[PDB]
Amino acid sequence: SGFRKMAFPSGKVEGCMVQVTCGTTTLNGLWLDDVVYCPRHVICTSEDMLNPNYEDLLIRKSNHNFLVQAGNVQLRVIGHSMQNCVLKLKVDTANPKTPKYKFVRIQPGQTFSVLACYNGSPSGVYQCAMRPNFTIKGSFLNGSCGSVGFNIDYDCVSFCYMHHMELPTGVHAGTDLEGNFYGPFVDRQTAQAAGTDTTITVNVLAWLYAAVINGDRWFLNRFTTTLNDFNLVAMKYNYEPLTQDHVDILGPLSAQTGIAVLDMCASLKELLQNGMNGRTILGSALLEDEFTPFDVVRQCSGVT
Amino acid sequence: SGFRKMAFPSGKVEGCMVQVTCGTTTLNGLWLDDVVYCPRHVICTSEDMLNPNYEDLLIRKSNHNFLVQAGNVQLRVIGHSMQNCVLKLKVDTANPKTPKYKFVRIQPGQTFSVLACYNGSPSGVYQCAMRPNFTIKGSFLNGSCGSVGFNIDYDCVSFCYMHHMELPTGVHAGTDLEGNFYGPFVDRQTAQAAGTDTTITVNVLAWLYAAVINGDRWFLNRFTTTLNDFNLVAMKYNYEPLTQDHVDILGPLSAQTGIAVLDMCASLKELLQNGMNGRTILGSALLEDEFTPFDVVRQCSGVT
Ligand SMILES: N#Cc1ccccc1C[C@@H](N)C(=O)N[C@H](Cc1ccc(Cl)cc1Cl)C(=O)N[C@H](CC(=O)NCCCc1ccncc1)Cc1ccc(F)cc1
Ligand SMILES: N#Cc1ccccc1C[C@@H](N)C(=O)N[C@H](Cc1ccc(Cl)cc1Cl)C(=O)N[C@H](CC(=O)NCCCc1ccncc1)Cc1ccc(F)cc1
Ligand SMILES: [Cl-]
Ligand SMILES: [Cl-]
């Protein structure tokens, strides 16, 4: 029993974290085999940051300008390239702790674990969703750029996020591991605004199913709604439209609990219209949207 | 910026998790040097669980009755003993991945990270507080007994919790790594009730300071309260008495934010009496008490 925001065990990623330094600028890098991946703005000075031409700044760099530190031992750089907004440094040593891994680019509404690091050294791990406006609501201080987000599937590490910047609003923006930003953002020090955010409807519904699996039923009701009548209410409360694909993704949870998806949508409608009136769901006094249906299945019992 | 429930990186503990089997009963063990630690009820059958005499059951065991599995390789047991409610199995191989570690017994209100494991294999990590009634509100399924809770201090792993059982109310009870239960509980399959729980006042105050460090101030007010007048309100809302030691522990946070502790207590009083009226603090619609002052300092910026 119980339900908590649960991160993946971080050990496989811990063995990959290193430190990359260019001038007086240090951030974190990811060491897989004989390549170190880090944000390309490590090659910028505080001057260059306002509007850099990275192709210009990189052609003025040599290999020995990059200091890569894996714990105590320096790694010698033997080659460097640029792939979108990530720098790739070839080094003369393969990481012996390299896990099975892949790089994947995720969709908004999907979750991952963040290993927050400072000077190449892990400090903590937490769970995040990619918001619909392509930011994450992270916990990051100066020095954390280069930290990665990841999922784990049967000892294969799927890296999906590299941290590049905090926006003026205090939320966080970054790229996949091939350097492509999530959302419209660019890697320069200018005030950039994210689009207006929305609530991830399919995830709220998954979390209501988690609550039922855990024995909490107070929010259920005898009613059902049509998908279209639900979305009219969803739109009014700044919730994402629910699609037939979302309905089908919630199939397993519906089947384990005997509550039809559109049945659960009528509960969500009533909760949006009337609030909770002082009650809590899984220890929360608001509707939580950072658990995917996969997250719920992974953590909850297969029997209600 | 940002504030999230943050676990310690779990890699150092991942390398210690093993599987212990006695009869048809399997749970998790902790492998440090040449000793495996696990809950002693692994030697019980479903019959024995109602009211076991463990000294009786253990003297009827031999070393070869214990199957210890570290990944794929079996570890050969060469000796076994009992220390309170933990079994200790000597094995013929020292764990090469043994970190620097110690065993510590914590106070209620302190937090730790849980590495949830099944069949010796880590599945996830989350943060927990030891409740005032000595339970934890964990997330555990069948098979998780043997999972450990821990803090990390400068690459030294301080193990503080081993998981032994879920109570009929769905909360969780266990021991320190020397086998002493937290709270009044015993390791037998009977319905056991925990004392009535209370809210950890010093932690709520720490979390209000986290909110101020992160730029949220809406709950402050111009008033102060005396420690005794605060506790009269605390008692009315089932909050723990606040001690002068708690006041002094919150010294650093008070100093970083310029808000006197008793000033913050007047904010807490007003929040208890009037609620939040639809507003949130650090993304929460209730007052959160599972962050210690140490947790706040560790995660938040040293500058407001
Ligand atoms: N994580 C993180 C982090 C956090 C603090 C310091 C440092 C770092 C990492 C570090 N690497 C990094 O992100 N620095 C970028 C500058 C930058 C570097 C490189 C690149 Cl490519 C782009 C950018 Cl923008 C950074 O300083 N951002 C500022 C962070 C900041 O002051 N927030 C205040 C939050 C206000 C608030 C909080 C809560 N509620 C409401 C409001 C915001 C900002 C300021 C000017 C600007 F013009 C663009 C952005
Ligand atoms: N974690 C965990 C876990 C969770 C589920 C299954 C198995 C395990 C691990 C496993 N190892 C283990 O804990 N089994 C013990 C039995 C036991 C083994 C060994 C020892 Cl030493 C002591 C005890 Cl008590 C266990 O089955 N408990 C029950 C778990 C349970 O049904 N909860 C229902 C929750 C109801 C609820 C939920 C939410 N909101 C309100 C109410 C509760 C219980 C039942 C009878 C009894 F008499 C004592 C306790
Ligand atoms: Cl794809
Ligand atoms: Cl002590």
Side-chain angles (χ1 to χ4, degrees):
Chain A
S1 295
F3 200 72
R4 272 204 190 261
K5 221 145 230 174
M6 187 167 312
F8 287 99
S10 56
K12 288 184 176 60
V13 179
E14 293 174 48
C16 301
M17 297 307 304
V18 300
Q19 187 180 200
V20 184
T21 291
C22 231
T24 58
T25 296
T26 290
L27 42 69
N28 304 280
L30 184 72
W31 185 21
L32 298 162
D33 299 317
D34 63 344
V35 172
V36 176
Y37 305 77
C38 74
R40 71 174 171 176
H41 72 251
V42 69
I43 72 168
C44 289
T45 62
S46 292
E47 264 284 62
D48 300 310
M49 275 304 319
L50 183 267
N51 197 32
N53 187 279
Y54 288 96
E55 188 187 326
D56 232 29
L57 297 174
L58 183 56
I59 193 169
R60 302 173 199 250
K61 295 318 218 64
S62 47
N63 286 337
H64 53 280
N65 292 134
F66 305 92
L67 315 176
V68 176
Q69 215 117 44
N72 274 349
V73 295
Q74 284 196 33
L75 304 186
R76 196 172 109 79
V77 180
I78 59 182
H80 60 271
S81 60
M82 185 157 69
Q83 179 176 12
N84 306 306
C85 302
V86 290
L87 176 72
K88 300 202 279 192
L89 308 173
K90 191 137 159 175
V91 291
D92 80 314
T93 300
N95 184 0
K97 299 173 162 208
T98 300
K100 186 177 183 184
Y101 72 95
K102 65 230 290 180
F103 293 164
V104 305
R105 178 173 179 82
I106 59 166
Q107 291 294 340
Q110 172 62 44
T111 57
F112 52 94
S113 302
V114 173
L115 183 72
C117 296
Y118 297 88
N119 304 99
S121 283
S123 67
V125 64
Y126 54 88
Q127 275 299 98
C128 276
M130 178 69 63
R131 303 303 312 167
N133 67 357
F134 294 106
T135 60
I136 68 181
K137 288 187 183 166
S139 172
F140 286 124
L141 308 176
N142 194 37
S144 59
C145 289
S147 304
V148 300
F150 62 96
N151 289 281
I152 298 188
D153 165 63
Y154 292 109
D155 284 44
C156 179
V157 178
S158 278
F159 298 100
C160 60
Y161 180 76
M162 177 164 280
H163 182 49
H164 285 246
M165 52 168 179
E166 181 178 299
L167 269 32
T169 54
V171 300
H172 300 107
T175 70
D176 58 34
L177 267 290
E178 291 179 355
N180 311 110
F181 266 96
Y182 292 98
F185 310 107
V186 291
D187 50 346
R188 60 175 146 276
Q189 189 163 334
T190 56
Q192 298 170 60
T196 46
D197 207 16
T198 58
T199 299
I200 308 153
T201 307
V202 63
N203 286 3
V204 173
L205 287 168
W207 168 84
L208 293 183
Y209 280 111
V212 174
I213 294 173
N214 236 265
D216 213 332
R217 288 180 80 86
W218 68 257
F219 47 86
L220 296 182
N221 57 46
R222 67 192 182 87
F223 305 108
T224 301
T225 183
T226 68
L227 190 54
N228 284 338
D229 291 274
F230 175 80
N231 283 323
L232 296 179
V233 178
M235 194 160 298
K236 184 185 254 65
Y237 292 89
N238 198 32
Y239 272 52
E240 290 226 280
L242 193 74
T243 80
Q244 185 56 53
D245 190 50
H246 295 154
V247 172
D248 301 328
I249 285 185
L250 293 158
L253 287 170
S254 183
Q256 180 186 341
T257 69
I259 292 159
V261 171
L262 294 171
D263 244 281
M264 194 65 91
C265 292
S267 289
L268 179 48
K269 182 196 305 161
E270 180 179 306
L271 282 168
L272 284 177
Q273 295 167 345
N274 306 330
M276 288 181 206
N277 223 85
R279 267 163 313 186
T280 63
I281 301 185
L282 293 178
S284 182
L286 45 72
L287 303 167
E288 300 273 354
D289 74 344
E290 301 220 339
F291 298 95
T292 63
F294 173 96
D295 300 341
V296 173
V297 164
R298 150 176 179 243
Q299 167 169 186
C300 289
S301 184
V303 51
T304 302
Chain B
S1 295
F3 200 72
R4 272 204 190 261
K5 221 145 230 174
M6 187 167 312
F8 287 99
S10 56
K12 288 184 176 60
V13 179
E14 293 174 48
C16 301
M17 297 307 304
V18 300
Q19 187 180 200
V20 184
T21 291
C22 231
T24 58
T25 296
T26 290
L27 42 69
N28 304 280
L30 184 72
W31 185 21
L32 298 162
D33 299 317
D34 63 344
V35 172
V36 176
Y37 305 77
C38 74
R40 71 174 171 176
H41 72 251
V42 69
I43 72 168
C44 289
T45 62
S46 292
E47 264 284 62
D48 300 310
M49 275 304 319
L50 183 267
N51 197 32
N53 187 279
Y54 288 96
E55 188 187 326
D56 232 29
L57 297 174
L58 183 56
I59 193 169
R60 302 173 199 250
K61 295 318 218 64
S62 47
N63 286 337
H64 53 280
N65 292 134
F66 305 92
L67 315 176
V68 176
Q69 215 117 44
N72 274 349
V73 295
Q74 284 196 33
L75 304 186
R76 196 172 109 79
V77 180
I78 59 182
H80 60 271
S81 60
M82 185 157 69
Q83 179 176 12
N84 306 306
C85 302
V86 290
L87 176 72
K88 300 202 279 192
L89 308 173
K90 191 137 159 175
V91 291
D92 80 314
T93 300
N95 184 0
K97 299 173 162 208
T98 300
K100 186 177 183 184
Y101 72 95
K102 65 230 290 180
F103 293 164
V104 305
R105 178 173 179 82
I106 59 166
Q107 291 294 340
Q110 172 62 44
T111 57
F112 52 94
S113 302
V114 173
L115 183 72
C117 296
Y118 297 88
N119 304 99
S121 283
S123 67
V125 64
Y126 54 88
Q127 275 299 98
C128 276
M130 178 69 63
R131 303 303 312 167
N133 67 357
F134 294 106
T135 60
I136 68 181
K137 288 187 183 166
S139 172
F140 286 124
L141 308 176
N142 194 37
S144 59
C145 289
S147 304
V148 300
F150 62 96
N151 289 281
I152 298 188
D153 165 63
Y154 292 109
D155 284 44
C156 179
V157 178
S158 278
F159 298 100
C160 60
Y161 180 76
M162 177 164 280
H163 182 49
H164 285 246
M165 52 168 179
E166 181 178 299
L167 269 32
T169 54
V171 300
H172 300 107
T175 70
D176 58 34
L177 267 290
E178 291 179 355
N180 311 110
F181 266 96
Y182 292 98
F185 310 107
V186 291
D187 50 346
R188 60 175 146 276
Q189 189 163 334
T190 56
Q192 298 170 60
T196 46
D197 207 16
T198 58
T199 299
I200 308 153
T201 307
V202 63
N203 286 3
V204 173
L205 287 168
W207 168 84
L208 293 183
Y209 280 111
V212 174
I213 294 173
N214 236 265
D216 213 332
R217 288 180 80 86
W218 68 257
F219 47 86
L220 296 182
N221 57 46
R222 67 192 182 87
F223 305 108
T224 301
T225 183
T226 68
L227 190 54
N228 284 338
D229 291 274
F230 175 80
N231 283 323
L232 296 179
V233 178
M235 194 160 298
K236 184 185 254 65
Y237 292 89
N238 198 32
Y239 272 52
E240 290 226 280
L242 193 74
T243 80
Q244 185 56 53
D245 190 50
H246 295 154
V247 172
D248 301 328
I249 285 185
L250 293 158
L253 287 170
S254 183
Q256 180 186 341
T257 69
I259 292 159
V261 171
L262 294 171
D263 244 281
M264 194 65 91
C265 292
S267 289
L268 179 48
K269 182 196 305 161
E270 180 179 306
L271 282 168
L272 284 177
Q273 295 167 345
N274 306 330
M276 288 181 206
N277 223 85
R279 267 163 313 186
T280 63
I281 301 185
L282 293 178
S284 182
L286 45 72
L287 303 167
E288 300 273 354
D289 74 344
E290 301 220 339
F291 298 95
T292 63
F294 173 96
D295 300 341
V296 173
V297 164
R298 150 176 179 243
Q299 167 169 186
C300 289
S301 184
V303 51
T304 302

